[model samples]
Target: AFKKPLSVFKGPLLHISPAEELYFGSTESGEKKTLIVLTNVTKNIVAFKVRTTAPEKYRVKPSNSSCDPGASVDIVVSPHGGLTVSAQDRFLIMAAEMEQSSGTGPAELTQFWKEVPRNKVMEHRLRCHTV
Candidate 1:
C-alpha cells in the first residue's frame, strides 16, 4: 500500500440537512411547516432533542427520539404562536451516543439527558430566518 497524507476530518455524530440556516415561510392559508432532518452517521444509537430559543413561537414534533444506525428522521417545525420570526430565534440540536438498547421513551429520554455528561453531548445550532 502507498502512503498518503495523514489528514482526517472527524465530524459530529449527527449529519444535519441544511447544515446552517432554517427558514420558514409565512402563509395566509395556515401555518406552514418547516423540516429539519437528522441522520445518524455513526454506528451507535444516537438520541436527540430539538430545542429553540423561542419555544412559545414554534413547535417541534418528536422533539426527542433515538436514531438507529444509518437511520434518518424528519422533525417537523411549525410556527404556531406568531407569524413573525425574531433575530434571536434559533434551534438547538443536541445528541448523545447510547450504549444500552432500551430507555428510549419520552420520560426515559428526559432522564437520560439529565444524567448524561455535558461534554459527552454533541450540540449543533441553526439560525432561523423568515422567507
Candidate 2:
C-alpha cells in the first residue's frame, strides 16, 4: 500500500441548520413542531448521541444518531416528552462525535470522541414541549 498526507483537521464536523430559532409551534402557522439538524464534513461513520438538560421538555429519539460522511441529519424534536409549559427553561444540547478511536491510549483512545455544544435553546414555548 502507498501513503499520502492529508490536512490536520479532516473533521467529522457537526452542523446545525435552518439558521433560525427553532420553535415548538409554527412561526407562521399555529402548529407545533421542532427539529435539530446536523452535518458531518468528513468521510467516516459518524456516531452521535443527543440530550437536553430537561429531558421532560422534549423527546429526542434515535438512541443512536449517526451520519454518513458529508451527510446531514434532521433531528425532529418531539414535544410529546413533557410540556410547553416550561418555556423559559434554557436547556442544553450536548453531543459527542467520534474522532477515530479503537482501544488506543489516552492520545489514542477507547470510544474516544469529542464532546461539544450543539446548541442551547428554550426547551419549549408557552404551552409547548407538551404531551
Candidate 3:
C-alpha cells in the first residue's frame, strides 16, 4: 500500500484543462459561449465523452469525441434558459463545478409546455423591462 503516492493534483489524472472554472456572460452566445478546453496530457491517445453528471440543462456541441496524445478539443458548455415569458436579462449557469465536472441544470421539460399558467403570455400585458 503506497500511502504517499495517493494524492497528486489533489486526485489527479493524465488529462488536463487550462482553468478550473468556465464562465459565460449572461448576454453572450455562440463564439462567446463558455469554452471547455479538454486536453490529454498523457502519453497515450485517449477517448472521451461529454456528459452532464447532473440533470441536463446545458449542452455540449461535440459530446462524444477523442483526442490524440498531447492534443485538445474546445467543448462548449452553453446554458439553456429554456422558454421564457420575458426575453430580457435571461441567464443560466451550465456547470456546477468551478473545480471540474460536466454539469448543466435548472432547465425543465415545462419549457416545452409554455403553459406556465400566469396568463401574461395570453393577455400580452408585458412591460418594457420584460422585453
Provide the clashing-pair count of each candidate structure: 0, 7, 0
In terms of lDDT, the poorest run of 10 residues in model 1 is 1-10
* Highest-scoring model, lDDT: 1
Q: Which has the greatest TM-score?
A: 1
lDDT by residue (1-131, candidate 2, tens digit) is: 12222112122255544332444544344544565566676555455556555577566665345666677676666555225635444333333445453232344222334432444211222122332
For 41-98, candidate 1 gives per-residue lDDT tens digits of 8887889989999888887987888888799788878877656766678999899988
Per-model CA lDDT versus the true structure: 0.77, 0.46, 0.36
Q: Against the true structure, candidate 2 has what lDDT?
A: 0.46
**TM-score per model over all chains:** 0.81, 0.52, 0.43
Enumerate residue pairs that collide in model 2: 24-33, 83-128, 83-129, 83-130, 84-127, 84-128, 84-130
Model 3, global lDDT: 0.36
Which model, 2 or 3, shows the larger TM-score?
2
TM-score of 1: 0.81
Native-to-model Cα distance after best TM-score fit, residue 50 in candidate 1, in Å: 0.8
